[PDB]
């Protein structure tokens, strides 16, 4: 008899963004794998709460693209270069058994 | 290029329009003033050579 259309709230997007902001801010005293463990925890905590309100919010999808690639860029800056060919995806997404960093992604979608 | 500067309208009401051929940026540049509001710092170039 009816349909419910869902979206993530604005203040929940902003709270996710501030959480990533303090990851990046308190990471000049962490090692690459802890920066990525915090990214993974925050991103699972968002995706598993919202789960289909995220698919329908076109402003999240952009937030997640920019935030994921800010985290990657802080790891480059941690080494001392941002050349895009010194750091293909393989080094970030390889699981941690094969020595990679173990990122989980949502920024390789088409928006 | 990087953008030069940076609610409701009635002409944009979707019940009053007829889209028979959809506007495109080629038209909006061919006729700067007909096809664009607030067209500022614009050169109107045309040629029927």
């Amino acid at each position: 008899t009816a349909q419910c259309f869902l979206r993530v709230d604005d203040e929940s997007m902003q709270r996710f963004h501030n959480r990533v902001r303090q990851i990046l801010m308190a990471s000049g005293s962490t090692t690459f794998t802890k920066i990525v463990n915090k990214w993974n925890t925050a991103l699972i905590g968002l995706m598993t709460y919202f789960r289909e309100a995220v698919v329908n919010t076109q402003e999240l999808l952009d937030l997640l693209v920019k935030c994921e690639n800010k985290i990657q860029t802080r790891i480059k800056i941690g080494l001392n270069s941002k050349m895009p060919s010194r750091f293909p995806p393989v080094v970030f997404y390889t699981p941690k058994e094969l020595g990679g960093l173990g990122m989980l992604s949502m920024g390789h979608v088409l928006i | 290029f990087e953008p030069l500067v940076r609610d409701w309208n009635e002409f944009n009401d979707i019940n009053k329009i007829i889209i028979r051929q959809p506007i495109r940026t080629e038209y909006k540049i061919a006729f700067p003033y007909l096809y664009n509001n607030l067209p500022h710092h614009v050169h109107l170039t045309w040629y029927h050579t």
Binding site: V65 | E2, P3, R24, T25
Partner: peptide, 26 residues
């Protein structure tokens, strides 16, 4: 054609801002 699609500037966006048309449109 920038037909009101895409970014103003793909500069601080983490993408190249490349746009395409939904090939499965019909």
């Amino acid at each position: 054609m920038y037909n009101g699609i895409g970014l103003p500037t793909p500069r601080g966006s983490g993408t190249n801002g490349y746009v395409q048309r939904n090939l499965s449109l019909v």
